[PDB]
């Protein structure tokens, strides 16, 4: 599913991402925009054999199992395909585990290069939350 900007904003808030770990909803929408262009079915293979999945492009090397990633760990305890459904539950709950520690949203390269330090708040402007 390819989400509209405000449509994904409402769904994410509905899934408890607004201010999760101190990150306002704008961050998540902006991260989704640049990681997958709001497309839950986005996938990108990497040279290390891993693959990034879903709206937030979660990597299989550590968070999910796709049965072909070398030295793969499945910390979110799910098949990577679960990160591709129109139902964002899996991606959201896995992302919550990822952002909970480590380096926060700095875990998302696109968020770090296109959202961090900008009016991330703009991505929710005019939205029907």
Swiss-Prot record:
Reactions catalysed: Hydrolysis of (1->4)-beta-linkages between N-acetylmuramic acid and N-acetyl-D-glucosamine residues in a peptidoglycan and between N-acetyl-D-glucosamine residues in chitodextrins
Disulfide bonds: 6-127, 30-115, 64-80, 76-94
Source organism of the structure: Gallus gallus
Full protein name: Lysozyme C
Domain C-type lysozyme span(s) in chain numbering: 1-129
GO annotation, cellular component aspect: cytoplasm; endoplasmic reticulum; extracellular space
PANTHER family: LYSOZYME C (PTHR11407:SF28)
Purpose of the protein: Lysozymes have primarily a bacteriolytic function; those in tissues and body fluids are associated with the monocyte-macrophage system and enhance the activity of immunoagents. Has bacteriolytic activity against M.luteus.
UniProt-listed GO biological process terms: cell wall macromolecule catabolic process; defense response to bacterium; defense response to Gram-negative bacterium; defense response to Gram-positive bacterium; killing of cells of another organism
Keywords tagged on the record: Allergen, Antimicrobial, Bacteriolytic enzyme, Disulfide bond, Glycosidase, Hydrolase, Secreted, Signal
Intracellular or extracellular location(s): Secreted
Domain of life assignment: Eukaryota
InterPro entries, per database record: Glyco_hydro_22, Glyco_hydro_22_CS, Glyco_hydro_22_lys, Lysozyme-like_dom_sf
Sequence similarity: Belongs to the glycosyl hydrolase 22 family.
Gene that encodes the chain: LYZ
PROSITE patterns in alphabetical order: GLYCOSYL_HYDROL_F22_1 (PS00128), GLYCOSYL_HYDROL_F22_2 (PS51348)
Active site: 35, 52
Annotated positions binding substrate: 101
Tissues/organs with expression: In the egg white and polymorphonuclear leukocytes.
Main subcellular location: secreted
Pfam families in the cross-refs: Lys (PF00062)
């Amino acid at each position: 599913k390819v989400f509209g900007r405000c449509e994904l904003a409402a769904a994410m808030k509905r899934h408890g991402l607004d201010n999760y770990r101190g990150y306002s909803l704008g961050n998540w929408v902006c991260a989704a925009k640049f990681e997958s262009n709001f497309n839950t079915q986005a996938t990108n293979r990497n040279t290390d054999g891993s693959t990034d999945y879903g709206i937030l492009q979660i990597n299989s090397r550590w968070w999910c199992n796709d049965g072909r990633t070398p030295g793969s760990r499945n910390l979110c305890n799910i098949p990577c395909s679960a990160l591709l459904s129109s139902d964002i539950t899996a991606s959201v709950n896995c992302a919550k585990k990822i952002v909970s520690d480590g380096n926060g949203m700095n875990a998302w390269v696109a968020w770090r290069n296109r959202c961090k330090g900008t009016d991330v708040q703009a991505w929710i402007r005019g939205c029907r939350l």
